[PDB]
């Protein structure tokens, strides 16, 4: 369908003959210089391909304040998610109207030049409610508040180069290259996929039968800008993603990257993936159960209601011109070993199997058989490569303050002792002297699957510069993982408690 | 690099606003329509999306001499293989000059439109040898006098569209669109490789090679339009090439199919292939040993030298405008577990495996062991799944003439004998009664994998309509694959000898 607004603002386009001016410009030893950060990365980019239509530049405050309580840019456009350039006060001060400013990645590469209109400081509290619901734990809100900056800068752009990624040069279509990717197999019917996700069985599944139903090819557009905390890396999900795609028939699907960074903002994120899939030249969109929705609070409470998000796109259906299909979710029979609509079985007493998140987690922690019916096995191996089980995981055991017995002689007994076992992993003591370089560099021997023994605990301002995962404490409070009977337990005593533990926890098998 | 002649004619390009009024024209009542022959079609499509620039239409009687005697068109441009409108006399006869006229594909679709600059008898015994060295078992002299039309039609071409073909949207890319594929990832930097066959370890390993001291990117650029009499089917190799396109690293290589049609004329065409693979977009290409020979002749002399090739491109270096690089075959090193060049290796007693393209088919012949280090194993299940082994081949029994047995009651014999062996052929006896739509079916069951029991021999005039792969003829004359002791010989005797031969060419296995 035709972009939303009617042109595709691809800027990288329009632009192109004043690159070497913009370039030149923005280079200029005295123009203000805005050092973007990850998520106006990935914000900028879809407005620069034209990925954001009609947005040509990050919204003033009129266009804002329309998006935030009316869901519409300014002039009536459809439009949920506001896109703006949050910065700090050191900075919005030395800005004004007209002021042309470079906005730059790494402090080193120029991406566009932006045209100030306004400089405001918006009303966190009403977006965070207004936009977000109101639930200080949704991801969006935490964002907002602790990370983003207090002013918002509107401005036109002109586009220099898109933000530089040197992963996957060949899937990161822009949506003209995509468009053009339609147009050169005659593709004009297209069904798009939305995922953050790997893909498992049903979700081939799935989208082969939207595909059916909607005489149309597919799409598979996962995003790989920021998606939601804890989700699977990137890198692994594209691994997968190409891994599935060989699966569909010859010639029916098409794998793109969408560098967009989701707000997990459920209903009103659905209709803003509508019109991103139909700028970049889907004419099907599928709206998933608790579409975008980052799932439930502490207290066990839905951010969105499982359907809202199908209700608010149905809701705009008629101004959308991208059609959504019906999300049939399926299910494996294996007494018919095939896989059916949930929506479609039991009632008549049918049989049916599935692996709940939990469960994957969990087969993939202690290295668990996952079946074929479920996830195809070359997807499962990849998923295991980055996700391996405990015997294969790094840890850290972190001698406590409590301790009184020998650092130097209980360390080396540590390693001595884990140096018997076989299996391969790389042990070190690991000594920080409380330096910030060096902290940092634990949750990178974890991850390498490295053991490690730390002689002593670092200063607790420091506890945010290394990850909690896989380190352990062994200490006399009640807070020790590893619980010592005293502060000077036997080594020989100590020792057998810490491979134990690690032992009870999968890190060591016999 | 730029296309040969500095312009890229595409001419779909050129004439999209002329599609409607083109079409519109073919399809007038009063036009002369000609359709095109397979090769013909191949040639068109190069020529419409200017992969044979400067060529914008099929060579006038000047162009087409200087082209045969020169290897040049009239204006000096290097070109080595004329590329022509043949068609027979009949229709040449109702031509003349600045006649426009329809070229269609399958007596349907429209194509172009020709405006006749000349028409001419052109004499094939000084062609077949200035251009294909004068071999009359060289397959282009072969095709040249028994397929070819004994007239040339020069003129200038107008595009309707390219020819239609449903296999492979994807991999199909012209001239531009390849061109396009390389800048979005920018590739400046790309080495082609050409090829007719199935691609195995070596010839992935060969190509990495290149890439790595180019400093390039690489195309695996395959012909599936029309290659040498006998070679794999496009689709098994399109299906290789898939496969192995995956064993390179990510985003070193890309595959994109040509549909050329080869002459299978060594030297000259290497030289054709490299001014083709400019247009196409590579900045280098890779000329192999013997490059696009079609081997040795009948008395076994080759057709040509096998440096020939490499010969006469550098040659035309300094005019070519694309870096040829060198062919560095490589082989297996057992002792080292590697790969390398050949010219590198011996002299100094070092043990080296390969596996000839005769043991290849015998091996595929017998469902023999293929190795991992001569081909991917999932390139190999490809091959064996297109041409499989005995126990799995069809095959076809003759009662011959000289039979005097009942010929009802040996076919049944025959049938119920094979039915009692296991397998899952399946098996029919099979009249014809010398109709040529009946005839023409029996290869298309023994490419099935099905028996046929044939009750009697078809007339020799039809003889042409029945391929002679893995058809048997039981009868007494010394001719016979299967020789009867006399022509009355009892059934019983007669049903044993059938399938001992069957089983002693391993149709059967007990
Ligand atoms: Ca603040
Ligand atoms: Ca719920
Ligand atoms: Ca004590
Ligand atoms: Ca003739
Ligand atoms: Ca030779
Ligand atoms: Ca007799
Ligand atoms: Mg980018
Ligand atoms: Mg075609
Ligand atoms: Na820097
Ligand atoms: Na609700
Ligand atoms: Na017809
Ligand atoms: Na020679």
Same mark, same amino acid.
């Given at each position: ?217 597919? @799409? ?34 098409? +794998? ?76 494996? +029979? ?117 053991? @490690? ?58």
């Amino acid at each position: 369908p035709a972009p939303h607004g009617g042109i595709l603002q691809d800027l990288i386009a329009r632009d192109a003959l004043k690159k070497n001016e913009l370039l030149s410009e923005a280079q200029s030893s005295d123009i203000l210089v805005w050092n973007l950060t990850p998520r106006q990365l990935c914000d900028i980019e879809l407005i620069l391909n034209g990925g954001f239509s009609p947005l040509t530049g990050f919204l003033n405050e009129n266009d804002y304040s329309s998006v935030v309580t009316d869901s519409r840019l300014a002039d009536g456009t459809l439009w949920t998610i506001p896109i703006t350039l949050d910065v700090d006060e050191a900075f919005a001060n030395q800005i004004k109207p007209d002021t042309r400013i470079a906005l730059f990645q790494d402090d080193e590469i120029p991406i566009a030049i932006l045209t100030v209109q306004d400089v405001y400081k918006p009303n966190k509290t009403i977006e965070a409610e207004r936009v977000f619901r109101g639930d200080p734990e949704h991801p969006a809100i935490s964002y907002l508040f602790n990370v983003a900056g207090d002013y918002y800068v509107g401005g036109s752009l002109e586009a220099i180069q898109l933000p530089q990624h040197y992963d996957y040069p060949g899937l990161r279509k822009t949506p003209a290259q995509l468009r053009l990717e339609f147009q050169s197999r005659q593709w004009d019917r297209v069904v798009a996929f939305q995922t953050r996700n790997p893909m498992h069985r049903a979700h081939r599944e799935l989208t082969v039968r939207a595909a059916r139903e909607a005489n149309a090819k597919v @799409l598979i557009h996962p995003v790989v800008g920021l998606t939601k905390p804890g989700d699977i890396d990137h890198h692994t999900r594209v691994r997968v993603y190409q891994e599935i795609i060989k699966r569909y028939p010859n010639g029916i699907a098409f +794998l793109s990257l969408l560098p967009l960074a989701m707000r997990m903002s459920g209903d009103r994120e659905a209709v803003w993936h509508a019109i991103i899939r139909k700028n970049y030249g889907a004419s099907h969109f599928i709206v998933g159960r608790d579409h975008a929705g980052p799932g439930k609070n502490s207290k066990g409470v839905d951010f969105y209601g499982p359907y809202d998000a199908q209700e608010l796109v149905e809701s705009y259906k008629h101004e959308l011109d991208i059609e959504v299909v019906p999300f049939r979710m399926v299910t494996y +029979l294996p007494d018919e070993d095939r896989y059916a609509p949930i929506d479609q079985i039991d009632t008549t007493k049918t049989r049916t199997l599935n692996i709940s998140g939990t469960e994957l987690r969990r087969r993939l922690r202690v290295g668990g058989e996952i079946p074929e019916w479920f996830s195809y096995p070359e997807v499962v191996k990849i998923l295991r490569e980055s996700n391996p089980p405990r015997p294969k995981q790094g840890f850290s055991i972190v001698l406590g303050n409590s301790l009184t017995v020998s650092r130097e002689q209980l360390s080396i007994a540590l390693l001595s002792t884990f140096l018997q076992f076989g299996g391969g992993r790389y042990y070190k003591i690991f000594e920080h002297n409380n330096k910030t370089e060096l902290l940092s560099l634990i949750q990178d021997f974890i991850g390498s699957g490295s053991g @490690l023994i730390i002689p002593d605990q670092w200063e607790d301002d420091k506890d945010s510069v290394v990850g909690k995962q896989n380190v352990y404490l062994l200490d006399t409070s009640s807070s020790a993982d590893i619980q010592l009977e005293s502060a000077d337990e036997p080594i020989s005593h100590i020792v057998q408690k810490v491979v134990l533990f690690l032992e009870d926890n999968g890190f060591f098998v016999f």
